[PDB]
Design a binder for this molecule. Sequence first.
Ligand SMILES: [Mg+2]
Ligand SMILES: [Mg+2]
Ligand code: NA
Length: 323
Amino acid sequence: LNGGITDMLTELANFEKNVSQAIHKYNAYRKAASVIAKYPHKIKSGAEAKKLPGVGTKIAEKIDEFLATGKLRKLEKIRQDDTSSSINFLTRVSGIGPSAARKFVDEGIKTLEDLRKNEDKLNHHQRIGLKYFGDFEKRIPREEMLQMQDIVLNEVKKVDSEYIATVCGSFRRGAESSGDMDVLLTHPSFTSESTKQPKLLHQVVEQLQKVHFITDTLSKGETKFMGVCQLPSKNDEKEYPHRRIDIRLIPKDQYYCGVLYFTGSDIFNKNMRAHALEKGFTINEYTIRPLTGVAGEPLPVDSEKDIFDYIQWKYREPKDRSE
DNA sequence: CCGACCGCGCATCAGC
DNA sequence: GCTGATGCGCG
DNA sequence: GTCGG
Ligand SMILES: [Mg+2]
Ligand SMILES: [Mg+2]
Ligand code: NA
């Protein structure tokens, strides 16, 4: 109902993040954008909006101007500025953040041609992000997420029938399209107690590469792989776009905290974690522990709901965590 | 007013 | 090489 | 930029 407002604020949040490098302003706009996005009425005024938490005086003024004119002067100016525009653009390349973006514009590299021209000034992650720049902009229809899932789950079962591979992220929240693919991996040999087998993640990355599902690698350690994959296409069929894929190997006994984390959303995780802090707990992808203001021992978790119970939240299905 | 704003993996660099 | 700080990315 | 104390 409030698409224009939420777009406005998301553009503002991006600006603060990419250009101003004021992350708290970025988070302020993102929170507001999210609370408004779920408000079940068409906002008639900035006062009506200010009743929501996250919407304050400043954002209320914004919403009133946008409502009046259909525009924000602040944004129309930001759009008109070259340094800001270029910086904001460059940041869309995976691996180029606000700092790299600003250094690049400093050197006179500010367009997509410039980047291609200057690949030797790019690190690996950056080169692959430029390579698949167009692809990584596309969303993934759920139907393709379903094929991708089959592949990953079937291949992993071939490396060792004891791996458990769970697709998380937006896919798990039931989205009709996903920004990418997110795979939580567990193997019984790897727990909080011990790592009984080396290269648990490697063998999996290896296998998925062997069958040409994984095509590139952005980053890779003992527990986190961040890379690129592609569905196989039929005879004469145009190739599918290349897609980002993240794989996270998590202690088997810490699954429920792991799957909570990877299911998100990102904003939901930030809100859940902040609420946990007020309630007197700290939540990460491994454990929830009680808080001198210093973290205690891991409390026993047997489901995602047990985590919710701790911080006195009613349970929310994954499909309701898309904040 | 003002402090506080999650939590963490991997790549890179400085500095030793 | 190592440690630690910083950039970037994940949700 | 917002908000809680
Ligand atoms: Mg995702
Ligand atoms: Mg994401
Ligand atoms: Na991802």
